[PDB]
Design a protein around this nucleic acid. Structure first.
Lengths: 71, 414, 71, 414
DNA sequence: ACTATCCCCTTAAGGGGATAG
DNA sequence: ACTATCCCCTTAAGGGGATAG
């Protein structure tokens, strides 16, 4: 798939997936036990976002991640 | 002499016991690059050097029985050089729980991969009754239990590094075998993920035969595969001496947070909490860390394994000192005043309070309680109309009776 | 490749790669402009680690990441 | 009428100008799922709805020339309904910088994909001299410039949505064409990533022909492809009115941090800083945000593009008011007292001070200065012995002379 | 309906700087 | 040599709680 190199490229991607799946920041946040504000921060200011936060949101999107070379 | 650690005939690494008696482990470079590569235990993440932390010792120690008395029974049988984990494991290291096969460095001695001895109804009666007063297995847990290989229609004993398919439990509780056989049937009836168990009758002895979920035949049906796994003491690199939360073991929060990192996180978290309620309803008080396990998958992924070792402490009341007010859940729930654990004092508001702090969907905690509220009744029936003709009705009634007592606390709200 | 679902599985993986490549926390930290302590924290306590930190370390390891389904 | 945005004959989306005059953009669902999918601009991340933020307006506005006077020259030529970005783009929206092709909604009018008119040495002399007193292109930048298609051995003019291969610049600075032709040759000689440019002579006019790095022929050689890209004003969703840092544009820190997210991050960061030094050595003061670009790759990846639009302000000293002490770098460096930008006051310690705050490897800043310290001399020579027989020696000497003056500041330490 | 903010409050990341094992 | 800590200090994540557009 597409290789990602920054917090921003990440959030843009994840936010696209949430929109393509019709989910709101609220339903996902309830499922994973975090505040809706947290999801919002993540989408607009991913730089200083925690990794557990990131993985909880990754789980709520029914997604996963993988490492690879940057060629 | 180093202990070569194998996992389904694949060299994972070696266990070393230095002169100073320090246990160390080192992953085999070939394993670090293997397709099947994964840590032996989450407490021992794949890395290059010699691992020297206590997790190494604790991990392997957790493969052997808890009772220091039982270990003696092992040093006795297979003449061990000590009750030390390493020395013992050098004797019965073959069919250990999970999927590790510990074989001494100096001992290729290609053991039969698929071999077994079709036991007679007498030999079985001998082996069963045996555990009370080639067979290099290792079952860890709270009570006394062995393990057999079921093939065709005969209970056979493995020979070599051949795996077993069933964990067999013997009567200790006066009918622990019947207590668990019931708790399991009921667990299934309520949609909880549990192993199918059966009761084997050999002459006079009565034993429980649980199908193992850490064993699977390959596609060809030519090889019985061991699925890697570890309990919550291992996962956290803790000594079995702290398996209970009151002693220092992990609780709901610890486990729940860890489950967030599961491949099936949202489902496992739901299932784990659901089970906290089931344990309450059937007065099960053995829900300690070594009773929950995760499967270790290629790359380090894990997901919760089926629940096992379930027994109800209900059949042990009245006639003796033991009373419903003396039953406490191994893992506490959140209460207004600190934490609660007394079954007979526990109420829905407690599970909801716990869910509140853990931040587990409130709506799902409501749905869990709700589902039980309306399913217990029908569940008991189907289970009951399943109990063999010769099943101790005092077990059925004691369990069934107290379940409804607690259940009422639910239906009364849901 | 292997799907990752948590900060810890991540750090274990990334730390393996650093070791397999013979790098130290120091040489990587200098290259990406962060403190060696930061790399150490990341390897042992990834939960509360920033995403930029995570991506800087990802770049120093000559790696990249990608999203995917968890099946 | 909406403007359909194409990218190499692939529908990316549409630009809409509402009644209230609000510019909006919406990605085409088909594009969001495309293999080639990527945002038009990092300031406009792929999403489902109508994008209404100012980044939409600023992005497209940044495709047109900076000078409000020049835009008039456009409204005049292709009779535009306004100097408004949308109206103008509806006229010359075909060959815009980067790789977008804006064609009105009501206008499939399949335009020749590969078409051109082999110009004569006279027609060329006409078009060149033209820009001073089918051709729907759009070159953005600081000065007046057009763009042609080079094929075989003839300068041809594109016809339709056919791409161009060269950015042609005309003499404004009295010999801007020669100033840049030199700065580029020198840039290459020093290992900096820059486009190969040549000087085209048509009758009396003398023009610069820069090969475009945002253009590439497909494997078949049957199609000229536009490579998506955007400058630093666009990347950050800023108006060209703030392209300089002193006005409000991005500086070293902003750019450097952003480069950390490059597919070639470590190399790009090194290259960007290296260029900050080169700009210093050749007294280039045009290093504003719209002079740095990143390529946009499938999925949203980006990497720094080659440097371009390089001119030395050295040839403009002495004889006039302008003096070396009046030359300031567009992007400031870190100084003891705030920030420094005066070329003639800048010293190695400044680049090292900047590197210190940005936390760019100190050792690499040392190696950059070092490499220049010992390469400039040899570089000037090879470049010089390359300058065509008819090259203004006042340009060579003015540049070469002042380079050594600053260079000495380096060799003196490295 | 959905997302961005906002106040309060505790915890701690990560840079400086630097050392114990 | 390499990694884990540790003090100082500023900035802010994220949970509570809750509302403006």
């Amino acid at each position: 798939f597409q290789k990602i190199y920054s917090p921003t490229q990440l959030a843009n991607a994840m936010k696209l997936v949430r929109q393509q799946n019709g989910w709101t920041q609220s339903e996902l946040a309830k499922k994973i036990g975090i505040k809706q504000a947290t999801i919002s921060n993540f989408e607009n200011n991913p730089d200083n976002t925690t990794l557990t936060t990131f993985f909880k949101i990754l789980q709520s999107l029914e997604l996963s991640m993988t490492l690879c070379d940057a060629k | 002499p180093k202990l070569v650690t194998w996992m389904n005939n694949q060299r994972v690494g070696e266990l070393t016991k230095l002169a100073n008696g320090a246990h160390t482990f080192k992953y085999a470079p070939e394993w670090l690059a293997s397709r099947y590569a994964r840590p032996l235990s989450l407490s021992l993440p794949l890395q290059r050097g010699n691992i020297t932390s206590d997790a190494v010792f604790n991990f392997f120690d957790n493969l052997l029985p808890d009772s220091p008395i039982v270990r003696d029974r092992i040093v006795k049988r297979y003449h061990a050089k000590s009750r030390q984990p390493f020395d013992l494991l050098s004797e019965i290291g073959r069919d250990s729980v999970g999927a590790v096969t510990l074989i001494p460095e100096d001992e290729t001695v290609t053991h039969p991969i698929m071999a077994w001895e079709k036991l007679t109804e007498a030999r079985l009666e001998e082996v069963l009754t045996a555990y009370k007063a080639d067979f290099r297995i290792s079952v860890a847990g709270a009570q006394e239990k062995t393990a057999l290989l079921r093939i065709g229609n005969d209970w056979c004993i493995p020979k070599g590094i051949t795996p077993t398919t069933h964990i067999i439990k013997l009567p200790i509780l006066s009918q622990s075998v019947d207590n668990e056989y019931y708790c399991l049937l009921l667990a299934k009836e309520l949609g909880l993920n549990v192993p199918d168990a059966e009761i084997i009758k050999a002459g006079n002895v009565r034993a429980l035969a649980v199908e193992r979920f850490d064993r699977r035949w390959n596609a060809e049906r030519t090889v019985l595969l061991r699925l890697p796994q570890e309990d919550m003491c291992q996962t956290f690199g803790l000594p079995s001496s702290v398996k209970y939360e009151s002693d220092g073991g992990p609780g709901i929060a610890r486990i729940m947070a860890f489950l967030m990192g599961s491949s099936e996180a949202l489902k496992d978290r739901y299932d784990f909490m659901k089970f906290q309620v089931f344990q309450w309803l059937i007065g099960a008080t053995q829900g300690h860390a070594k009773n929950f396990s995760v499967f270790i998958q290629a790359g380090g992924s894990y997901r919760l394994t089926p629940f096992y070792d379930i027994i109800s402490a209900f059949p042990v009341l009245g006639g003796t000192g033991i009373h419903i007010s003396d039953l406490k859940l191994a893992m506490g729930l959140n209460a207004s005043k600190g934490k609660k654990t007394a079954i007979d004092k526990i109420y829905p508001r407690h599970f909801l309070a716990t869910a509140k702090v853990l931040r587990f969907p409130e709506v799902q905690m409501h749905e869990i309680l709700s589902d039980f509220a309306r399913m217990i009744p029908a569940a008991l029936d189907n289970v009951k109309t399943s109990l063999p003709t010769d099943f101790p009705e005092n077990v059925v009634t004691a369990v069934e009776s107290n379940v409804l007592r607690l259940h009422g606390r639910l239906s009364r709200e849901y």
